[PDB]
Amino acid sequence: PVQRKLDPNTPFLTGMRILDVLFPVAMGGTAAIPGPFGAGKSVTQQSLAKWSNADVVVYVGCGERGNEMTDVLVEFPELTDPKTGGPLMHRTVLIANTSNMPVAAREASIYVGVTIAEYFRDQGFSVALMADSTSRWAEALREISSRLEEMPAEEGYPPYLAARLAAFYERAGKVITLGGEEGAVTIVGAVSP
Amino acid sequence: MIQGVIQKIAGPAVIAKGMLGARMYDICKVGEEGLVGEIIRLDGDTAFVQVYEDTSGLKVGEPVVSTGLPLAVELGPGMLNGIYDGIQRPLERIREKTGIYITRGVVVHALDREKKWAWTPMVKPGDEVRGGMVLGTVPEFGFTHKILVPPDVRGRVKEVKPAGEYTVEEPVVVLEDGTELKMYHTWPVRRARPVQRKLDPNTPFLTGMRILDVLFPVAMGGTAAIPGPFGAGKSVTQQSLAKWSNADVVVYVGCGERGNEMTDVLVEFPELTDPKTGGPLMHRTVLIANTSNMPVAAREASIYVGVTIAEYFRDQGFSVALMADSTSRWAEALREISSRLEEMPAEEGYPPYLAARLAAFYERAGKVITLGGEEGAVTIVGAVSPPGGDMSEPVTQSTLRIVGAFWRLDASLAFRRHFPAINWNGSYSLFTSALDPWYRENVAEDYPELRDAISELLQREAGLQEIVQLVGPDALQDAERLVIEVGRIIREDFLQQNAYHEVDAYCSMKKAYGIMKMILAFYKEAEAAIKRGVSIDEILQLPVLERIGRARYVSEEEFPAYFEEAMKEIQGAFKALA
Amino acid sequence: ESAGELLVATARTQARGEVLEEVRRRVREALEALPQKPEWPEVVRKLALEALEALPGAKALVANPEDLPHLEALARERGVELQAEPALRLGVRAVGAEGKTQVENSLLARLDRAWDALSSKVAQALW
Amino acid sequence: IPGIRAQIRFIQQVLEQREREDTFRLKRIKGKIEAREAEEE
Amino acid sequence: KKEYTGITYISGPLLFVENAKDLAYGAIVDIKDGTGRVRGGQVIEVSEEYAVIQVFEETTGLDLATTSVSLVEDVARLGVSKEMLGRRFNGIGKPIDGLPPITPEKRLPITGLPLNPVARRKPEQFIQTGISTIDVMNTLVRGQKLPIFSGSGLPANEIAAQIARQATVRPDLSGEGEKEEPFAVVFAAMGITQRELSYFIQEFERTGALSRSVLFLNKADDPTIERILTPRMALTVAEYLAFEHDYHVLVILTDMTNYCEALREIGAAREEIPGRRGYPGYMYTDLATIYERAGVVEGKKGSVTQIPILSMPDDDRTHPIPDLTGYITEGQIQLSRELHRKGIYPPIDPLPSLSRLMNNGVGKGKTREDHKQVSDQLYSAYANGVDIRKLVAIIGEDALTENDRRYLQFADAFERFFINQGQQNRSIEESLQIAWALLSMLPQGELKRISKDHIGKYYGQKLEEIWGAP
Amino acid sequence: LLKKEYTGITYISGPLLFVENAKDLAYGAIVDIKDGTGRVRGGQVIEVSEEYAVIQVFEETTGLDLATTSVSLVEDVARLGVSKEMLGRRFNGIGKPIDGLPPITPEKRLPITGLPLNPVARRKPEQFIQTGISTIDVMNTLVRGQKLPIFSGSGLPANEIAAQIARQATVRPDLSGEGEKEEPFAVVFAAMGITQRELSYFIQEFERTGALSRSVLFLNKADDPTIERILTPRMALTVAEYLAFEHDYHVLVILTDMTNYCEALREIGAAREEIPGRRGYPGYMYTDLATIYERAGVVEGKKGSVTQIPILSMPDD
Amino acid sequence: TEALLARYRERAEAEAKAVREKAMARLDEAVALVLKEVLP
Ligand SMILES: Nc1ncnc2c1ncn2[C@@H]1O[C@H](COP(=O)(O)OP(=O)(O)OP(=O)(O)O)[C@@H](O)[C@H]1O
Ligand SMILES: Nc1ncnc2c1ncn2[C@@H]1O[C@H](COP(=O)(O)OP(=O)(O)OP(=O)(O)O)[C@@H](O)[C@H]1O
Ligand SMILES: [Mg+2]
């Protein structure tokens, strides 16, 4: 819960010129970064995590490589936080569900990450929720729907894929917390068409 | 055996109750008529049967008896000179019995059970026998047929029938175990026949065609595909191979042919002569003739029946050639069957296991050391028919991944009446490397290099055609026009063949080599002349050009002189030039 | 080239294979010679008991006629039937109450199922 | 020409996927009809 | 006959009957309602529990209380006799011409038996359709399966009726020549409208072609099962005549597209999963069992020839029905909408047309010696003419060579006098005369595909023979 | 130690077999299927309930009858007998020697499905493999712990490059210059749906250049059972992981023609009436291929490695 | 050279004979272990 949703009016400084000037995102806003393999989704989102002006960053590895999680683990401890000088990893929360870990764990991990981000929002901070692949969450939903023997809508996905995505992305926003403070959760969700 | 009764008839689907004990994919005779079918499902005390023939007239309660064996062929004396359907039914005998139509449910034995055979035994009592050994020989036209022991049999000989004339049903040999070995045995068509080893091919499958036997060779035991759009020229090449190929036995499979197209083969072949012996060609041939109106099961099983027969003749020590005409038709039959079982299509309506079946068919080819200890080979040449003429079809793509030679027939060439339509840019052969030793050791070590030279000339011609497109050939300089002229010569006088022609339908290795050396020497002399500084336009008039042109039609026995005369004329016509 | 070393290695592998096959042959011959000793009834009794334990709802027992005089008591003790059969030696098989299940305990079966690890053990012991 | 060919291939693939989905729906309705007949005749 | 009353289900075209284990699969039944009206049906599934009957027409008044079923025959059979010549039947054999029912010599199964491949003989004699584009450029040969591919608005019906009205054999050309032999036309119409029905009836009546033909006419508003049965009935009559009374029969199947659509609907009614594009997975085999019933047998002087007519759904030759027909048949005759809108009848486009067995039926002793070469030369000349015709729109006539203008005039004259013959019946001789009169417009020597003997013999005839009176 | 046989077979239909009284068959178990003729076919439990268990017969079910057929359990989870003496040997994709030498004495039996590597347990790949090919070594460098497929075409020479890397792959300890001596290197070769011609070629190359001594070959032909193609990469990677993380080996796995693997996967998926995907391929193909590929890497505190080079052929480029 | 190949062949034969000789001394122990293990 939250007292009130506000109107995003302060930029989410990504550190990337093209994004920060041509296609900005506000502090409580939502962004999608679709692209084919080799386009630069993981590099863009890790760059966001290294240089963004967010207080806390929750990186969700939803059905992606384990190398991309160990890289964060091994390198972020030795990078310096832009806004507090301390080690970068101290402001980061990692949710990892690699490609060959269980499938429904992806559905679990997206909600776990958004809940952690919402918690730190309620603490008065400004949070960035980088979701590494919503496509794998969609795939996990498709698999479970096949197990339930339901009717797929298109390409096999259950007809309620859009509702779930809407909820997940609607968790975001700059709000006045229940405690009178102000916080924001920003979601940058990658898509693997 | 398991015997039951029909519960339910719905289309070609039949459910029989009381079949507890019936095996999967066994052959059953359904109804009073005796309609044949296979078990595709088992459910408790019920077996689902697909009837090959129409089921109109069946009623509930009628009997159903299981043969107990899967679809299998009868292998033994009598296959040669035979015309069968796709499940080994002798069409000639069915005609003798039934008139012009094939009445439903007629049963006729694949091997004539009334004929005698001169049985010459080879084993003696007390001998040990293992799968594939030769119990005794039986004459069959110009071959010595070998009565092999079935692959899955063992034991020691108790009794051997003395020499004489016996029918196929006679127990020619009896084991100590009491098992009776007759002149024929049955083998499932979907089980590959075991062999002792499989070898890398090393000798060519001379098809009597210049382009194939020179630039795109196929080995004895290799696999080749011959695709092309409609009217491309694939049936005629199939038949040309069947006529002049180097194979000891030929198995020709027509899987979904048109009625009149099948009549063409059925009537033409009996007249043709065999090169080796001079007798009828049919005495070295087994024809499987399926038309588009025969049951789907027969069409599906055609290629398997053919491969099993070819494997048998391999195990006898012979070298066999199997020609599958329009394997696109077999693929369509497979698709129809899969539809009738309500399977999920993959790609263009084909089942997701089409590639597996194509592999189970083509991978059976190869040169082997048979179980008996003699070398035999099976070579497969299958034709494909892309719907739109595009090699993107699943059948063609699956074939590519397994065939060692690809013989692309191009519709553009065909519209120009360039027969064979074998596009040399798209065709390829993966045996070309491994067959060089045979050519080197049989005629000359320079044959491979002359081949590479001819190919390089073809490529150079291919490059310049872009120039010749913008401007007529005459504008090109001397060197370019010379390569264009030698390319025209090479195409029209070495790569082109007429299957119908009396003398041009066949070419030997030495003759093709001679024509290659003739053309290449002419090219070298023209190069020397252009270097000397003579006009190429003077070359166009030399009668040696006409000498090259007629080198196609010269008889085989006439060449060993025509070649020396042409070589002398090559020397003179140029040296005498100003 | 090292084809000589390859020859040596393949010869060593062949020799070790011969040793293992000799071990297998000796083991199977000894097992088949076991019923010649008076201790075979007790092992088969234990094996039948284990098989029954494997079937909580067992209904029947099967063995060769010479085995029955020793297994009738157990069948009475465990409450099941027993009929003679041309079955395998050196063990006893059962049948489930529904009748669709079976369990077999021939010593050759135990040898087959244990060879995977017995082979490693014997290879380590030998060399 | 290559562009138009790419478009043709894309449309063929999308249409074929639609056909596969319809076949799946048909198979499921046939199975459900079988279930209803088995439980109710 | 026995009567069944245990009706337990009536939905769509299907009704279920209990205790009916004596019904044979495929048996034809009669459903009598409470009012005494009788409807026909076919047993599509026989089981111990019940039998499923596909009811023709409709079930607007049936009930589970009074309805009753009965057996008509274990298998669909047609009473066939030589007296059918000159009669009109509905599609399941019922006369529609108002004359008394025929007296059967024998009742044959509709689902004919496959012909043994070894029993056939190679086609070797030609049918003269009276249409130049066919007889000359895409000859029709006895025992062939040569379809007419058409579009939505093109006149396939007119061409079919004209060929029926004009088709004949030419024994006098056969070797030393012969006087006469039997000939008949079995016309099958599937899913035709009232307008097409009236057209066919008037055309077959007003020229006497009825006396040598048998008409099966299945209307659009008639049952679909009758549509499925119509082609098989026609082919049963054709085989009877051809192979038991030595008739050369020409079978015309008016709309195979309608047949395939009805087959699709029937298959869906029987709860069968479709194949590609929604059509049944066994459409190839059904079309084969229809088409492949023509041919010529060894030892028999009769013949059966087919001219199926297929209206391509969207001009699409890749549509499944034309593709399968192309696999099974031996050529195709293509109508072109351009020639139709230009006012040319019959609008047969030579360039996409073919006849695979053309070579067999044309040559010395059958037609004329120059037939092949004349056809080849006409094809090549027309192709060059169409190309140059496109080029003129950009480059204008002046910049073209004299040969190019000659080819242009050849293309125009060909479309105007050879392709466009109208309703005039042309013997092969007149067709070849027109062909030579047109080829003469080009200079000798440009005719590379015609030997010098034929050019010397036939060249030079005045174009005015046809230009003076088209 | 005992064998238990189930004979309550109620339904055979295509690749599936239902067993009624099968409450003790675990999901994913491997079973043997014994027919009247006596021959044994392998199956797997793909669904288990209180009513019956569903078994997928690894080969076609011709010859099975409900009166005689019986199903016995092999093992709870698929396992492969691994040993350090598999080097310089040839197998068939189900783990059976095809080189004529006797079977290998197992040192361990590890599950063929493997287990996921903890992301915390990995380390970043940091060391260079010298493939001997300039473009790869200079512009597309391969690193110990990397999975770097070669996207081939219809007729391109993928097999030639695979063999060339197998011959020429080298670690090059000298340039590292960390003071240690030369380190062990091995090549595991997995061929799926390979023709007899290509099998002969691969054997010729490996045996000709002598890389066979340092190589393990898992060869699967195109006329073999379909599911033996699915198990080939898993067994190859089990041997690779064994060597790498129990004997400090540097194994280069070369999987050839993954296109064949995905085709076999489509066949097996369409066997059990599962919803299809982009072109008929199963909707779980991403997870399956990830299961095969993500088994490459270098772990923390261990000096082995697994590098994969999946060679596939792009349909119609 | 053929001499080195012959020497390797002799080495292989010696290795096989040595393997057999080493094995014979303990085969009875292995058989006893196997029998004890398999038995109930
Ligand atoms: N901003 C960048 N600067 C430099 N290199 C980049 C950049 N973005 C991407 N790359 C290059 O692209 C490669 C792939 O990028 P990235 O890891 O972001 O892929 P991705 O789009 O997430 O793809 P996938 O679907 O495989 O996960 C990176 O390894 C790097 O080589
Ligand atoms: N080698 C040749 N010599 C002479 N004529 C040839 C040759 N190849 C093709 N032709 C001509 O081209 C025609 C092509 O017919 P062919 O039966 O070979 O076709 P196809 O490619 O098998 O086609 P389809 O898919 O219709 O069966 C032949 O009838 C003949 O007219
Ligand atoms: Mg990425």
Author numbering:
A (entry chain C): 194 to 386
B (entry chain B): 1 to 578
C (entry chain J): 61 to 187
D (entry chain G): 169 to 209
E (entry chain D): 5 to 474
F (entry chain E): 3 to 319
G (entry chain I): 81 to 120
Quote what the paper states about this structure:
Vacuolar/archaeal-type ATPase (V/A-ATPase) is a rotary ATPase that shares a common rotary catalytic mechanism with FoF1 ATP synthase. The thermophilic bacterium Thermus thermophilus (Tth) possesses V/A-ATPase, which functions as an ATP synthase in vivo. In the V/A-ATPase, the V1 domain (A3B3D1F1) can function as an ATP-driven rotary motor and ATP binding, ATP hydrolysis, and ADP/Pi release that occur simultaneously at three catalytic sites of A3B3, respectively. This cooperative reaction produces conformational changes in the A3B3 stator, which induces a 120° rotation of the central DF rotor.
After 3D masked classification with a mask containing ABsemi, two structures were obtained from the resulting dataset of the 30 s reaction mixture. In another structure reconstructed from 19 K particles, ATP or ADP occupied all three catalytic sites. The structure of the V/A-ATPase containing three nucleotides referred as V3ATP was identical to V3nuc obtained under saturating ATP conditions in our previous study. Two maps of V2ATP and V3ATP showed an apparent density for ATP binding to each catalytic site on ABsemi when contoured at 7σ (standard deviation). The atomic displacement (B) factor of ATP binding to ABsemi in the V2ATP and V3ATP was in the range of 30 to 59 and 41 to 77 Å2, respectively, although Vsemi1ATP showed a higher B factor range of 112 to 133 Å2. The V3ATP is likely derived from V2nuc, where ABopen is empty. Nevertheless, our results indicated that V2SO4 and Vsemi1ATP finally transformed to V3ATP (ATP/ADP occupies all three AB) by sequential binding of ATP to the catalytic sites.
